[PDB]
Symmetry: C2
Subunit: 193 residues, 2 copies
């Protein structure tokens, strides 16, 4: 059960999350919980760890910049992090909020949440499940999600590569800064395409 | 004159280059020579250094993989370079071939040629002139070159940003590996957009 990992039941967690998140974001997290379960089952990842990480991945999405900065100092994280924003922080720094609020200590779950946006050059299968589940969950409707979903039914590694290439392409299209760890993921996985 | 920098006259250099390069590539280098002169004049960069660097930037474009690998060992360059290819090498490693062939020692010219493909987080105005001149020279006709040319008439920094964003976007679109120094350029310049 979820109580094996955090300090409350699934039902209690959903009540807490309904306070922290706008409706659309909670629905998203519920979608990721479901997609992560399906992917985990397909690719032989612990379905419970996948479901919980999937539900939690965007828990800290609505923390203020101030709170993230406090957490960076508190946990004496990479000071370069202060150069970034919510996009980078909600996973990379938000894991400390999750740990504080829910007493989550499992290193695999924490890591999967940590790099859910940016990935890493090296990702566990659990990491990959969350990263992909986020992108393909049933509530998303971006153009091309059908292709992501087809790829994810066949290959976890290729789904990671596809998502990362699309994100890097989109950020450059938008003229948005790209976190350097994202490029590590990109170059590590792009061959799978 | 060009003999102030290399071991032969412009006319002799063009004869040497006509041997090393296919016609279309030499015409390109001639275009870059001209565009670099115009940009240098506009932005107060030494027009002669700009013209020569512009003419030379793609000198080593047709060296074999073997030759580049030899040069990497010879000059004991970053061993990670062996993971890449001609795209990275012709500037980054090709500068050593240019130095060998032409006795070029000017650090500013060498550097401008060195990073003409990938840029750097920190670029001199000369570096920037070559990087942009390459993209906007009159022979190029890619969709959107008109926008690059308008930008380059107004702002060198914004032209660098525009080109870098477009290249990162294109490489990710293509599913091609992206050299990490390119991302340094991207993140350094993207604000100018
Ligand atoms: C990978 C990456 C994503 N993003 C953005 C794109 C998304 O709009 C936003 C939220 O990402 P997420 O939903 O995958 O957590 O973060 C960056 O700003 N920089 C990056 O390096
Ligand atoms: C910036 C960059 C360009 N390229 C490619 C795009 C171009 O087709 C090719 C030649 O670039 P150049 O004409 O700007 O020297 O190199 C990469 O492969 N990786 C990179 O990181
Ligand atoms: Fe997220
Ligand atoms: Fe999400
Ligand atoms: Fe080149
Ligand atoms: Fe060129």
């Amino acid at each position: 059960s979820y109580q094996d990992y955090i300090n409350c039941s699934r039902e209690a967690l959903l009540e807490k999350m309904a306070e922290l998140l706008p409706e659309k974001r909670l629905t998203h997290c519920l979608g990721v919980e479901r997609a992560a379960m399906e992917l985990a089952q397909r690719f032989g990842v612990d379905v419970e760890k996948a479901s919980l990480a999937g539900l939690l991945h965007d828990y800290a999405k609505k923390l203020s910049d101030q709170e993230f900065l406090v957490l960076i100092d508190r946990y004496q994280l990479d000071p370069d992090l202060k150069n970034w924003g919510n996009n980078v922080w909600h996973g990379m720094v938000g894991i400390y909020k999750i740990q504080e609020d829910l007493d989550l200590h499992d290193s695999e779950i924490l890591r999967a949440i940590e790099i859910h946006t940016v990935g890493a050059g090296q990702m566990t299968d659990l990491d990959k499940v969350i990263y992909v589940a986020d992108y393909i969950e049933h509530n998303r409707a971006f153009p091309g999600v059908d292709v992501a979903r087809e790829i994810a039914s066949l290959s976890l590694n290729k789904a990671v590569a596809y998502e990362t290439a699309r994100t890097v392409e989109y950020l450059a299209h938008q003229g948005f800064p790209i976190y350097p760890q994202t490029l590590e993921t990109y170059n590590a996985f792009v061959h799978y395409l």
